[PDB]
Amino acid sequence: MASRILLNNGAKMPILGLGTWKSPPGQVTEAVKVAIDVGYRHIDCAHVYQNENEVGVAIQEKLREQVVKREELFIVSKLWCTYHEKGLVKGACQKTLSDLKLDYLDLYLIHWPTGFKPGKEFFPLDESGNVVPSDTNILDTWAAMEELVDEGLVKAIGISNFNHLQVEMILNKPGLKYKPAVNQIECHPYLTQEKLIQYCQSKGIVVTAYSPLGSPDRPWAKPEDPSLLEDPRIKAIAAKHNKTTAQVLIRFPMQRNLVVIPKSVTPERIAENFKVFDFELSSQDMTTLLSYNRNWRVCALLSCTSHKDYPFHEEF
């Protein structure tokens, strides 16, 4: 298992990164410091997470300490839905750069294909409770992303939560200048994503798997829902390999040529989650894990199903 995957912009991306959604602002600085100390070189961020300043404090301190050099880090962030207008994209990127206290991002993603009305609210609502869309299309937002590469603000651009028709729409864009480097999508044994992964990989787009542990801290979790970390079938594979269930869940996407971004703010788990370069799942283990697919999503953007660009009505 090599530590980095080559992107279609010519740069290498670490296959294991630290997620930061829901990492409390008073804990995430130490989490990122610990992560860098124990080997992580890739941090997955987003403006909508509201903690980029605190992530940035950690990055800056570890650079100052010379634990790592900037060239060795791979920092990812994402353009929120209220910034899809072409004229808002640069400033959104620059706010993230300023908060993360970086001069460039390694990768900047369109967070979702759905654009929303700009303004202070991340989910602007009409009086009837619906999320108000923007009229800016997926292709115009991509052209604005391309400009960021040409201005030196970002080394790579990509997409997130795009279905294959939406990926295809970008690939088929008239005058396309840069292909997406990455599509970051939810992926785990209950949402195995075979069709969309194969499509993206066939086009040279690297896939990053989010919520690889099934996001047991997601805000909308119910009692009722399936639980990867507690699934006896997965626990048995882990026991066979003398690893934790989380370590199996992280190794699984790695062996599919995916990047994976487990989140933790717990120092012991941050270290555990990195210790996934010391064992191999068999092909039979891999097929067995794939067999658990349920089409179950942590992140279904349920408030936005009427949006024209909602991604999850299409089969993939």
Ligand SMILES: NC(=O)c1ccc[n+]([C@@H]2O[C@H](COP(=O)([O-])OP(=O)(O)OC[C@H]3O[C@@H](n4cnc5c(N)ncnc54)[C@H](OP(=O)(O)O)[C@@H]3O)[C@@H](O)[C@H]2O)c1
């Ligand atoms: N592009 C998108 O739209 C999108 C959407 C969702 C997620 N993401 C990205 O993907 C990252 C990961 O997904 P996620 O945050 O939804 O969930 P996740 O990584 O699947 O699960 C995180 C949860 O698992 C716990 N955990 C971590 N390591 C563990 C271990 N070894 N043993 C037991 N429990 C463990 C964490 O607890 P503690 O933190 O308390 O240790 C936290 O409650 C996000 O943080 C974000 O960076 C992106």
